Amino acid sequence: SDIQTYTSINKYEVPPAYSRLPLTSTDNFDFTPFNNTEYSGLDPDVDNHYTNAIIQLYRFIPEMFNFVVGCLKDENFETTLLTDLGYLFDMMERSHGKICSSSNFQASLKSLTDKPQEHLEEYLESLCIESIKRNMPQKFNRFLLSQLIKEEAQTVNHNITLNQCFGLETEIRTECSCDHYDTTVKLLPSLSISGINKTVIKQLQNILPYIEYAMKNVTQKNSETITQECTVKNLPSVLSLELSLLDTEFSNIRSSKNWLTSEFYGSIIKNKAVLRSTASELKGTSHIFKYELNGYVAKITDNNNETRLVTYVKKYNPKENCFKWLMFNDYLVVEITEEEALKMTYPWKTPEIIIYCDAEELRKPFFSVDTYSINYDILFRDYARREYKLLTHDEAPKSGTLVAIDAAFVSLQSELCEPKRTALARISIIRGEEGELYGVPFVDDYVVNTNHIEDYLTRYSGILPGDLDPEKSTKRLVRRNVVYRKVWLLMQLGCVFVGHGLNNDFKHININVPRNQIRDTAIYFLQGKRYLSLRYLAYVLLGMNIQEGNHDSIEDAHTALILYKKYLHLKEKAIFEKVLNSVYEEGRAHNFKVP
RNA sequence: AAAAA
Numbered sequence: 001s002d003i004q005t006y007t008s009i010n011k012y013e014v015p016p017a018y019s020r021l022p023l024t025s026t027d028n029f030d031f032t033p034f035n036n037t038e039y040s041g042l043d044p045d046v047d048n049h050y051t052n053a054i055i056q057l058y059r060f061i062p063e064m065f066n067f068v069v070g071c072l073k074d075e076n077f078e079t080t081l082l083t084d085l086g087y088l089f090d091m092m093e094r095s096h097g098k099i100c101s102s103s104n105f106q107a108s109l110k111s112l113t114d115k116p117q118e119h120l121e122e123y124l125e126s127l128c129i130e131s132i133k134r135n136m137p138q139k140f141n142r143f144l145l146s147q148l149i150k151e152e153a154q155t156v157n158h159n160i161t162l163n164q165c166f167g168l169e170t171e172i173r174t175e176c177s178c179d180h181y182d183t184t185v186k187l188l189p190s191l192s193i194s195g196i197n198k199t200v201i202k203q204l205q206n207i208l209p210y211i212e213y214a215m216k217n218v219t220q221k222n223s224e225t226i227t228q229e230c231t232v233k234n235l236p237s238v239l240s241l242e243l244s245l246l247d248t249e250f251s252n253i254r255s256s257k258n259w260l261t262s263e264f265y266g267s268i269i270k271n272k273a274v275l276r277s278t279a280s281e282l283k284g285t286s287h288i289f290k291y292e293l294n295g296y297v298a299k300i301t302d303n304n305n306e307t308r309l310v311t312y313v314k315k316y317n318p319k320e321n322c323f324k325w326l327m328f329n330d331y332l333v334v335e336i337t338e339e340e341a342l343k344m345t346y347p348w349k350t351p352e353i354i355i356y357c358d359a360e361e362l363r364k365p366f367f368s369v370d371t372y373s374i375n376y377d378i379l380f381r382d383y384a385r386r387e388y389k390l391l392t393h394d395e396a397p398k399s400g401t402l403v404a405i406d407a408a409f410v411s412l413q414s415e416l417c418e419p420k421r422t423a424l425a426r427i428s429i430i431r432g433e434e435g436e437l438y439g440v441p442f443v444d445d446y447v448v449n450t451n452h453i454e455d456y457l458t459r460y461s462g463i464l465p466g467d468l469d470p471e472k473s474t475k476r477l478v479r480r481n482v483v484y485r486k487v488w489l490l491m492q493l494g495c496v497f498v499g500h501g502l503n504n505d506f507k508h509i510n511i512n513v514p515r516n517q518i519r520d521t522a523i524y525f526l527q528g529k530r531y532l533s534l535r536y537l538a539y540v541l542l543g544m545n546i547q548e549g550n551h552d553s554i555e556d557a558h559t560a561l562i563l564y565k566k567y568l569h570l571k572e573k574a575i576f577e578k579v580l581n582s583v584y585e586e587g588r589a590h591n592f593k594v595p
Numbered sequence: 596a597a598a599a600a
């Protein structure tokens with residue numbers, strides 16, 4: 001009777017799987033009663049958390065997934081939105097159930113928005129915001145696919161892959177004079193089911209007539225009342241639909257049993273396109289195509305008159321040749337049956353963005369970035385003065401290379417209660433492998449940021465107000481997209497990270513590193529509670545006085561490395577617990593404080 | 596509560 005119940009006995013009662021989920025405050029929070037499968041979820045602690053429902057809709061399209069993550073091998077810094085989506089898609093697959101966040105993706109989307117233009121102006125309206133407006137997910141669906149294709153032509157070895165999947169060659173006939181009209185053809189990424197004037201189809205009905213109308217329609221309203229005829233003669237791989245209907249049409253639509261057609265067939269014969277349920281309903285005079293429902297995003301108005309989005313998704317798993325359906329809440333994930341996934345009888349469910357895909361193309365396996373040859377030439381490049389030596393080609397990091405990482409952050413926004421923002425400023429990675437070059441960093445970069453910073457936390461983070469493009473401390477000022485890649489490549493190769501409180505840093509840098517690569521000195525030196533400060537451990541276990549004054553990540557990363565070496569000394573010799581219980585006992589005497 | 600910042 002817990003939250004994972006996705007089917008209530010009555011139609012009016014929304015199951016707890018669709019209810020509002022409480023935000024994760026950051027501290028101890030287990031999602032075992034929330035998600036118990038490989039497919040991860042996205043925490044809702046972002047500005048406009050409705051976009052996560054769309055991200056997971058595109059995540060499970062094999063043609064969409066394999067391309068966005070595929071661009072991660074090449075260096076693509078100018079195309080911000082396409083590569084952050086690849087960082088997100090790659091992370092959600094590498095987590096294998098663990099929670100993920102789209103804060104880095106949404107940060108680029110907000111910064112890109114600050115600049116036809118009316119399409120992006122609306123995307124900012126729903127950012128700082130009844131929490132979901134009307135036809136707003138469809139407008140984001142337009143803006144995302146439009147911005148991805150526009151950026152897909154700016155990568156190296158320019159690709160046109162997203163156009164060959166979402167391409168809708170749409171003819172737009174505008175008739176001003178008789179026998180003298182004007183036509184325009186432009187590639188559209190998705191279909192838009194606009195306000196239907198009338199339903200002339202009383203036949204013995206499913207969604208298929210609605211797609212046929214959007215593919216060949218005649219509009220007799222303009223301004224002069226011009227007659228326009230829009231028709232598309234292209235059947236792409238993936239069909240992206242945007243349902244924008246009326247409540248009168250949304251009430252009669254629930255009576256139609258099995259209105260959401262799972263699989264259908266259809267080709268082009270005349271200047272229009274006809275779609276049938278079975279292949280026997282229409283013998284193809286030419287090449288025929290079969291489309292299956294890859295997934296859709298539904299709007300849910302709960303019993304408390306609140307509203308949010310969910311995502312239904314299929315996946316192949318060719319071992320059994322079946323199809324596993326999946327409802328996706330924020331971090332709630334449930335494996336549901338196909339009958340419950342297609343039911344439109346419930347008055348609280350409203351289809352928003354539907355996606356059909358090619359049958360033979362849906363079965364395509366999801367390829368990871370590890371199957372490619374990745375370009376690691378960012379570590380060896382140059383993208384006050386910091387004393388650090390760049391690595392060399394004989395220092396090639398392998399699976400097991402030790403590195404010391406410590407990041408520094410600044411504050412952006414207050415709690416704003418009835419936590420919303422925090423920014424990355426500077427990270428520093430140190431050499432951890434024994435040798436001549438030991439304990440010496442190789443990247444000390446300052447992340448640039450244009451947003452107004454509330455507090456810099458100069459006492460807790462060594463970032464003076466010198467972090468912006470024109471005026472700065474002349475340090476290694478760098479963009480967030482590229483400094484992320486340096487961290488991402490080390491996790492990709494299998495590098496082991498050491499530091500103090502790494503589980504908190506990676507959450508704000510928006511990257512998930514497995515437990516086999518994280519050596520947190522806070523966890524090793526932890527009693528039952530009361531995590532010890534780095535200044536204290538550097539004083540009670542070593543003979544150095546750190547943290548006196550303003551912090552500095554290159555100092556915290558260097559001492560967190562030798563703490564791991566001091567932990568290894570007390571680990572080889574069976575003294576480990578004798579020191580742990582001694583610092584805790586002596587910690588009560590000094591109250592964890594000493595000048 | 597504490598670390599982290």
